[PDB]
Amino acid sequence: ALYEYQPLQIETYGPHVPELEMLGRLGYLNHVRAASPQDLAGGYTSSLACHRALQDAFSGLFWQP
Amino acid sequence: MYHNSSQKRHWTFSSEEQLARLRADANRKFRCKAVANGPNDPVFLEPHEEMTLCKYYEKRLLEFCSVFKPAMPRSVVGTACMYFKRFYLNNSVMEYHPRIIMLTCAFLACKVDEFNVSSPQFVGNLRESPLGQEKALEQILEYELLLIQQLNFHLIVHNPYRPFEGFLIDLKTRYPILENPEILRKTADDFLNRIALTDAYLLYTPSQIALTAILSSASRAGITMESYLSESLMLKENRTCLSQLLDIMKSMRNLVKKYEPPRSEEVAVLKQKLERCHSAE
Amino acid sequence: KRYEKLDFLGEGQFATVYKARDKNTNQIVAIKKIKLAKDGINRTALREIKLLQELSHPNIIGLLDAFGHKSNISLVFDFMETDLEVIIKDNSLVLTPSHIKAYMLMTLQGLEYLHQHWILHRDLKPNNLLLDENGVLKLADFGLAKSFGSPNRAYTHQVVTRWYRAPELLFGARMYGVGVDMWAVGCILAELLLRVPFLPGDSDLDQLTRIFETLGTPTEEQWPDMCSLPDYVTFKSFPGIPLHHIFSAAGDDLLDLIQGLFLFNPCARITATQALKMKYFSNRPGPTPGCQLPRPN
Ligand SMILES: CC(C)c1cnn2c(NCc3ccccc3)cc(NC[C@H]3CCNC[C@@H]3O)nc12
């Protein structure tokens, strides 16, 4: 009865969002404002802002009521 | 997140005729209530007149949030406008005046979007005598729970602005055919504002609205973007989804075209009728 | 207004909680009725309403209903028999490593769902981790929860109960992410292992002193940009106590989880997803089922 992690599948009715650690090496972070040193010291990285914007852009793009 | 939000589950409707039926039902219910309270009286407003007054007071809400000090973030204005739309989707302008509901929607939007404005600041943004500002504050607090009950306690509103920014990031990174997609922004912004005057926010996802605005800006710019939809967004592998998306955007654009602003003389007559109905409420 | 008030469950700054029956289905629920000028409905109530209407996870408290009268509103939640603080403080309960695994697993699953929807709980502590009668932990008390990921919004730094507050908040971070929750999880985990508050500082500087004394004063290699925080004051170079000296009964996998949860760098600090992926949860023993979790009775 051991735990195994499951990636927590939730249907976003839209295109695939690139992963948070993929964002820099795919060039997305070139197009968002760089996090200030205070924000980095707090744990804000501008990968969060970019990822959230990309997730909202794709959340229900393919969905119809 | 929109894809499991209460907005998607409850406040995105299949067609504009369901919205028409809901509004007609609200108008009819107020008429039936008033007749049972003491039938074809010209004092009432017809649903299209209620729609004209709702459009007029939506515009006044935009103005109020435009001149609001301190500067109101765009998400708060969108949240307030969505609240106004939903409230008058299920409620009559003849029962709850759209001026007080306008201000109550702005007030609840400020609270919900964590735009910390004290009530004195909020009512100081009303171009009125201070006694009138206190009266307006009393009415705003009186109607606030009523707004929350009429929203079915669904307070989170997903606006197209964040998906707009996300699509702009995605275009910059993945779609190099379009050099400087920021040239779209302003024009897309304009189209987005127009979409807010229509019933699209109740009919389409905010991402669909944002994509429609961006693609309309691009088409207005002479830029084709079928390649972004099909290859970049991978709709080359699912043509049914591409057809559905193109139909959604086409119908949003048509719904913007057939939008009619409220006429100033028509609005003056309907406002006088509204005051007559609320005087004899 | 279909709710029969059974008992009195508690009182807090913003509200009062009662046990109740939903007569329409005869359910046991908890009614949080909000207490109270010229400001309208309480913002804590509105925060909890707006956030809990958008979330649906087994390990997040369900807002079953909401209603009220003029400027006084009441929220209907799942009724929970106990919170993790009662288990931690019950000297009659033996917290086996499997029980700790179960509690941490449910907490991290709820927090992974919460962080995937860009919400910081931001008030995590053993009180806010409630347990229903079936042994299912749920995150509760969303009165301080806030959406994160938005550059345009500044957040307060006095937002987590001092004993579970991450060092970036004590150093005054205005922008932060999931770290402020995960640190608290570490603290909760530490308390689950010690049955005593891990870092019970009397003040903010005393809290920072406790943290650095227990885990070492962080260097700029551990925590780059640390000096940029608004309330950064340099501390003594504490060596810090090794984690196996603090958690004497912790295996190496549990020590790896604890070390990940307690990294000073909030970016390097593990998220709930990768905490759930660590071998501590995959190893033996398996987490205990909810039906077998210890019940303070
Ligand atoms: C409002 C809702 C989330 C809720 C459901 N059950 N329940 C119980 N149950 C009784 C109890 C007693 C002792 C320890 C925990 C729970 C107590 C309670 N007290 C209010 C706060 C107090 C601090 N911890 C979080 C609680 O929500 N709130 C609730």
Author numbering:
A (entry chain H): 244 to 308
B (entry chain I): 1 to 38, 42 to 284
C (entry chain J): 10 to 45, 51 to 311
Copy the relevant paper text.
The human cyclin-dependent kinase (CDK)-activating kinase (CAK) is a trimeric complex comprising CDK7 as well as cyclin H and MAT1 (1,2). CDK7 and cyclin H form a typical CDK-cyclin pair, whereas MAT1 is a CAK assembly factor that also regulates CDK7 activity and attaches the CAK to transcription factor IIH (TFIIH) to promote phosphorylation of the C-terminal heptapeptide repeat domain of the RNA polymerase II subunit RPB1 (5,6). In addition to its role in RNA polymerase II phosphorylation, the human CAK also phosphorylates numerous other targets involved in transcription and the cell cycle, including other CDKs. Therefore, CDK7 has been identified as a promising drug target for cancer treatment.
Using a 200-kV cryo-transmission electron microscope without an energy filter, we have now determined the structure of the human CAK-ICEC0942 complex at 2.5 Å, a resolution that allowed docking of ICEC0942 and analysis of the molecular interactions that are formed between the drug and its target. From a total of 6985 selected micrographs, 10,904,715 particles were picked. A homogeneous subset of 205,478 particles was identified by 2D and 3D image classification and then refined to 2.5 Å resolution employing recent data analysis tools, such as Bayesian polishing and correction of optical aberrations in silico (Fig. 1 B; Fig. S2 B; Materials and methods; (24,27,29)). Our structure at this improved resolution is highly consistent with our previous structures of CAK-ATPγS at 2.8 Å and CAK-THZ1 at 3.3-Å resolution, showing the complex in the same structural state, with an active conformation of the regulatory T-loop and the inhibitor bound to the active site of the kinase. The density for the inhibitor is clear and shows a hole in the 3-hydroxypiperidine group within ICEC0942, probably because the carbon-carbon single bonds in this six-membered ring are longer than the partial double bonds in aromatic ring systems, which generally do not show holes at this resolution. However, we find conformational differences of both of the six-ring-bearing substituents of the inhibitor compared with the CDK2-bound structure. The orientation of the benzylamine substituent in CDK7-bound ICEC0942 differs substantially from the conformation of this substituent in the CDK2-ICEC0942 complex.
